[PDB]
Amino acid sequence: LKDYALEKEKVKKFLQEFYQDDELGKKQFKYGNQLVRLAHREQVALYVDLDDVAEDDPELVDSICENARRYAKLFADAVQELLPQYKEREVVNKDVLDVYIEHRLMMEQRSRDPGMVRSPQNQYPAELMRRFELYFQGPSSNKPRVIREVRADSVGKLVTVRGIVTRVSEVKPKMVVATYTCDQCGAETYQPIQSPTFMPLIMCPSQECQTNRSGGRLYLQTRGSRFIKFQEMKMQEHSDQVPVGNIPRSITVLVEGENTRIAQPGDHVSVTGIFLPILRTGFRQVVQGLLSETYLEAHRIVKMNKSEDLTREELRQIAEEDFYEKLAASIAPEIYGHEDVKKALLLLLVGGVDQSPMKIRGNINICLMGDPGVAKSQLLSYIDRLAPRSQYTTGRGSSGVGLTAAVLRDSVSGELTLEGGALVLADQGVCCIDEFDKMAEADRTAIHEVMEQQTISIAKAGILTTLNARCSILAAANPPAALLSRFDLLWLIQDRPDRDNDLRLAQHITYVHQHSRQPPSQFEPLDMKLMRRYIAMCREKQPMVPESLADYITAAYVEMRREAWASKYTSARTLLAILRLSTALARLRMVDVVEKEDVNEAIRLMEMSKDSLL
Amino acid sequence: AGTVVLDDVELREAQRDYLDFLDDEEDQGIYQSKVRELISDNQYRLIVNVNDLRRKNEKRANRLLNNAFEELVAFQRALKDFVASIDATYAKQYEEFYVGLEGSFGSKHVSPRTLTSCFLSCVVCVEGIVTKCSLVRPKVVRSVHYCPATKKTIERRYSDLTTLVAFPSSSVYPTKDEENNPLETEYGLSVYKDHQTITIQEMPEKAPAGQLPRSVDVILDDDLVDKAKPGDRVQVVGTYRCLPGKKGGYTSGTFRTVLIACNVKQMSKDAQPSAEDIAKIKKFSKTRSKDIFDQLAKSLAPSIHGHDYVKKAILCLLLGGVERDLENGSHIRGDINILLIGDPSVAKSQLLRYVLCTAPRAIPTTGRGSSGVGLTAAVTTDQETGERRLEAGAMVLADRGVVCIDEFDKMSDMDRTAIHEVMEQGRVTIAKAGIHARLNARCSVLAAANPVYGRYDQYKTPMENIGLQDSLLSRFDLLFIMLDQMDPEQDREISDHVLRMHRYRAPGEQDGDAMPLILATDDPNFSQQIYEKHDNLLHGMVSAAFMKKYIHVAKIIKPVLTQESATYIAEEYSRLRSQDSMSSDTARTSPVTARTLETLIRLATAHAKARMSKTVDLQDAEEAVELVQYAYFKKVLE
Amino acid sequence: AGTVVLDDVELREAQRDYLDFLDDEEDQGIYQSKVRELISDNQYRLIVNVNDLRRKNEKRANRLLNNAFEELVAFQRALKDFVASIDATYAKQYEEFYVGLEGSFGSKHVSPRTLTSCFLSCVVCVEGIVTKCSLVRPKVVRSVHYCPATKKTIERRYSDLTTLVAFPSSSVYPTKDEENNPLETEYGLSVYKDHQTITIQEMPEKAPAGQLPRSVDVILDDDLVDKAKPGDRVQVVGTYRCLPGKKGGYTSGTFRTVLIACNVKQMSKDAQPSFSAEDIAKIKKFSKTRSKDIFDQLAKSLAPSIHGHDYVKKAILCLLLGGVERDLENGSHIRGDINILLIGDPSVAKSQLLRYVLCTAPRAIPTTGRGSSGVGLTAAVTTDQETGERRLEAGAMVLADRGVVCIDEFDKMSDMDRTAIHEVMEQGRVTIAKAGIHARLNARCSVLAAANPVYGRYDQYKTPMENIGLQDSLLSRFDLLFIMLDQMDPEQDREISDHVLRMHRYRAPGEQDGDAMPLGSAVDILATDDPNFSQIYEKHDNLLHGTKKKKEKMVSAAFMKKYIHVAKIIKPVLTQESATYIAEEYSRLRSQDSMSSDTARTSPVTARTLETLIRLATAHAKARMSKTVDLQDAEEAVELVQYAYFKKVLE
DNA sequence: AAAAAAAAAAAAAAAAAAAAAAAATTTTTTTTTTTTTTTTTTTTTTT
């Protein structure tokens, strides 16, 4: 119970006189500039930082957290009232809604009669004239909650949760303010929408129609009405924060406006937003009372961990001649040895360069075939955690529709939508397929098609589509033409006992068990964040093969093909592999031209991978 | 205003009796201490023992168990008054306090099949298995509204009429002011309580074999919502009532009955564990810190003779190693996997059943009785919302526990391959297009396999006698070949032990009678001395309960490898990999990989935990080395 | 439960402002003292002066006047809070403390005719006469029930939904328990509130002539139920509202209106005069410093505008002061009321003296010879016409009880009426009875009558017995009978003419500018506050055009009213010396030989002559504030009776 | 001063204007639950 006029004045003071040094120690009035852009219509969403609010008024932040929707509306009204005094020039009428807004304001000014008192139902709804949205960036003090722990005590509260996106619908038009036009009076009726559904109006309430006592039927218009991009996603508990014997819990997040098209399935997302109910009318409730479903009205969605979205010394380390070896070493440092396999996995992460002269994929596929207990699954899991877009499939737990897509009954409307499996979620990413050799034949055929065509051609009963799965494949198996012909690299890992090697491995593993970290080396291994940043910086560095390298590459190919022919499998795929591996090496070296060193390292990797087969 | 109550003799008597029962200073003080405990823990429900209530006041016990609603109302009023007396500032925080019950209910302890009309309005205790667990929905009990036109704020109060007659005026949610101004509901100020509905089914083992199951619907209000999940065995105590229908000029006699749970408790009363016992454990650890491990090993399975190394390994399993969660999220498992590959009638199955009875969260699985989705996680569709849901399997349930896989060898290769991830990294990664999940199952596997041909042919190598591939065997950190040795002396020992155990009789409880073939007495699974007395007929031995408590306390301790033990283990592992570690005529029972070094580290940590060492020393390392040496080699005769 | 307001900004502001106004401690604690006084008196209704309320906060005054129910509820909450703060136990004793209003209502002050629908839900102060009243009925505000079957005790509350939407749920009296157990109501424990309905009609002397009168229905509740009776010129301050109709289904749109009275007042002239410390000190000073001639001073200052008639003025003062009733142990009663009859020549200001008594004396009822006829004069017995029961209506004498009846044209009054009032003149009571009822109403009133002698003008050459056509039976009960002769003496005519012309030439200072006509026309009366129910005083009138000059001041009207009111309560005791003097003088007076020849008695001498001698001595003692009848008082009484009882027959 | 006539009043009886009281199950819908059928997926047997 507080004076909302006073609260509105407080938020207005904050917005108008808050400042920070975000730009090289220059007081710039952050939210003032944002308001300027909002008035100019160059910005749709405004993200208020509750950390900034608390910098001066912590109790206001507490009030917002205790009752966010109310204070969300208060901030929206404050911005609405502030826009005119920040407006500096005329809007360019970005869209049809802007045209409608200007027309309505113009004719309201025309029929103003300023002194006349207008009925409350005789004005434009506030949401009908916004063209902007206001969301809250949760305070840093608020520790993130857990989907299971967010309960009725948090209803109406600004909670921040973290989880995996298991599903997200496609952006749909959700009506905010329905508009109607009458067949008698030429006046517009408006119906703001708060319930999940609504009943369209029949008769017109316009003063003219009421006076004339005409029929005054009115027709619903999608033109003057106001819509907002609407998405419905489901976030899931992280594995590390589920109870002992419990399966992770899922929360329905509703995203609207500029927050849509930020989170896709499989992303690690931290969602700040308001926990709210939805009345459960209709259902013959078992228990009397106003029981209601729940959801999270999203305000700020951020990508976490691998889903995440430089300094002179950083550029120095990139330029350093040993940068490639540093990156190859930093991958899974707790796993001893396997320097060459680490280099191969780094190349798989970086990728080659896609060419569409007939489109030839630039992905690198690697299959670690090996003896039991040789870190195959450990490296697969490390890549799964590292690669920004990655999926992990162990055996037949995720088989069939777990790899491909399936038709599932949608919820926002109710219909057969298409949900993507592991391969789809790994699209333009990595799929780590452990226990490859034990996989079902159908899944193996699907992986075969994905490794070459980058697609999944499903023609089952309920589904007939061609999914796009542009994912590199890092498979693991234990002891072959059926795999050597296809996979870009086939790497054999045999653990042959040896006194010195086993002693070193035992020392390494014992130190790991002691200090929960890899033994110190000459160079500190790079963090997952830095590694992902460098990998991404390498992705957008497409180099090209000079005409000079043609002779050298052809000579190498013919030589290796002679070796394969003489010995007791080489093909054009071998030369393609050399090309894409060399391009990946060039990407890592930050050059636009593939070089002799690149081709040399490609051939060395191929030679050692094949030597592993013997 | 309406018809308030001026004075009520029965209510006053009930509240006075309950306040007297709760105020315990002239008495022992149990419930005063319990109220202080809940105040300290910031809760608003007290668990009151029906046995204590009956002891102090028979009349109040009968009244509470026969007319629960108003009696529980009076009890909760007394509870709030008592909490205010102890500290009013905390009593003001919570609107109401709740009274759950426990203890023994004579005829009110029933199964969903036996919960009939006779128990309507009474307090009942029902033990069963959860089948359905709806979502936790907020139910509004006090709604705050704001009128922008008049700046007024209003509060609407809705009574919990779940089982009482409700009229529409009670449930009318306000939307317009008196003069039809729009009202905006303030969610941040309104009050909601979590509400859930579950279903409790007659336990499959206790239900009659012939007929179909019987179930009961249970309403859980705040503080009792996420206490149970489908498939769990739980005890729910609450009032069995009738749910009102809906307004209608016609009605059939039928009524929909439910159970408003006042408390819910896990069947896994064994999943959880005094200063006397704590000091006893401290002295036991301190006194004989070297032979404590051996004494525990020998006392582990008293009814099974011999198998010293097998029992040592089982103790190491029950203790578990120390997991290593690295700075990069990498995971090194701490659980320990044992495969008893053995000749018929060598007590491997009995060891499995011992671990079932002893260890917390032990799940019994069989070769072909738990296939695929039943053994690991699964994905299904709700069939009502058309949405995909996870379903925990045997190992997901056994997370932070043990899975006893009898007849492991006769599992399909599909299932055995599916179990690889659980064995290695302790999780199940399952995905269908709709939903992908990474469930945690950090379980330890105790498998009981018989060799190909039925009986272990000692002339053939262990690789041949074990019909399993090296990739699978590497999963099991310890592999014990348990032969039915034909030594007459050991035969004498075993026969004497068996006959002594068969001759044993219960002390006093039995005198020549027959063991009987449950609702009459409280259910043991839910029921609330260092050494055994040296009976000559059982010994010719640490107590079971003290062993349980000591293992529980020693599980938490996290010993850290010391440099000396690390060097010793590394040298021994190098030798084990080397060829010289095995002489002629000895064959490896399982290939030695880095998995075996992890086995050594885990076994040494388990030994250090048995000793509560806080450091894994050369003693522990040597014991682990010796056990691995015994387990990983076999001498093949010609 | 249900909706419960949390932040009612208007209610909070109203409560704060009303509590600030009622604090009053810095504002010379007027309302603090009023609250303390009501606390001591054991009252639970505070009367607030709307003028003071407007002076403190004009906003609150306007809000209260234009929104009656809400602001009155806020004011009552503030009053209850203030009463608790001053004394908590009293606040807990009384559930709700009511607030009535008083003062000058600019436009809200109306009559039953001008009270239109524009005043609904407003505070209106309506003047009128109570045409009828209803029996005081108790309405249950909180009932208590006991269930023998279960020993439970429940208590139901009923809200005051008199002018609010009411539903069957609120007005159902429990008669069974939830298990169908018969209940029994505990009448002693239950809470009832007295409620009455009256009808206020526009005053006939104010209503437009020749039209039917306009009425209004008024609702009185606890502590206001019996504040008026039929025929009372009352001022009712209340809230005008529409009474809900019964649950219908079809409504004609017609709504009965009613006035929920928040305060009832009678004519302030009969109210207890306010005696401040300075006023009582001035009365003490007057009585002590001047006692020898105080009676003469008051008699001469009684009616300044009427010249001469000194003995008649003294007799009128004695009548105003009255005697003292004798309540003997055996029930026998003796009246202390003096009866005076002025008869004489036309144009001797006898009607003017009667009018002066009417204007000054409290509870003075005018009457004319034929204006009242029997049942109108004394009490009357009628029937209710709805219950079939007898009922009593108070006549002029009954209404004048403990007062004065000023009768004019007494000679013209029919013999039947004079015979009827015979009892009132002596026993001071009216004895009426019909078959279904009998009563003995109290009429303790002094009769001041005026009459014209037979033949129109007094006959100096005939006996007073023949001049006055009133027989001895009626003459005797008149304590004093004064014959006022229009003597044609040139000097007396000079004095009378000078006095009359001076009085005519006087103008009121300030209000009159030398040419004003003060008459108003039926609108200014309601525009300004009524000078009949309204709320520093000097002692001697300042010299003005009324008299030229001398070493003898004239008593102020207000001071004289206060002094007479104070002195009337005194009951001086008859002393032995005065008793003996009066007895011997009565013996001599009754012995006709004492009076000279050619002298005829105006009225016969009797035990009643002795009683009026005693009463006149008592009145003189009262005037002196003596508390004992002294020799001077007896001398004055004998002088007055001797002058009044004999007239010289000229020839 | 008394008798007769006139009228004046009181009370009782009667007839509308407005308000208040009395009387009131049956048909259709939808939701849940349960079962049946199709196709895909998985499992098992034979070569």
Ligand SMILES: Nc1ncnc2c1ncn2[C@@H]1O[C@H](COP(=O)(O)OP(=O)(O)O)[C@@H](O)[C@H]1O
């Ligand atoms: N070269 C190595 N360096 C460090 N640890 C290793 C190495 N090889 C195996 N390990 C450890 O041995 C265990 C077995 O490796 P894992 O990859 O699970 O077997 P697989 O290769 O069959 O998947 C892992 O826990 C891993 O930490």
Ligand SMILES: Nc1ncnc2c1ncn2[C@@H]1O[C@H](COP(=O)(O)OP(=O)(O)O)[C@@H](O)[C@H]1O
């Ligand atoms: N060493 C032993 N000590 C005690 N009992 C034994 C021993 N060996 C066999 N038995 C008895 O033989 C029976 C074998 O049953 P079980 O253990 O279920 O089969 P298996 O031994 O093949 O696992 C048990 O009832 C057990 O009492």
Ligand SMILES: Nc1ncnc2c1ncn2[C@@H]1O[C@H](COP(=O)(O)OP(=O)(O)O)[C@@H](O)[C@H]1O
């Ligand atoms: N003594 C007097 N002094 C002053 N005015 C007198 C006197 N006598 C008669 N009058 C005047 O005579 C007028 C009428 O007299 P009134 O009161 O009618 O006497 P009555 O009743 O005998 O006719 C009054 O206005 C009054 O002023």
Ligand SMILES: [Mg+2]
């Ligand atoms: Mg593996």
Ligand SMILES: [Mg+2]
């Ligand atoms: Mg067995």
Ligand SMILES: [Mg+2]
């Ligand atoms: Mg006259």
Ligand SMILES: [Zn+2]
């Ligand atoms: Zn219209």
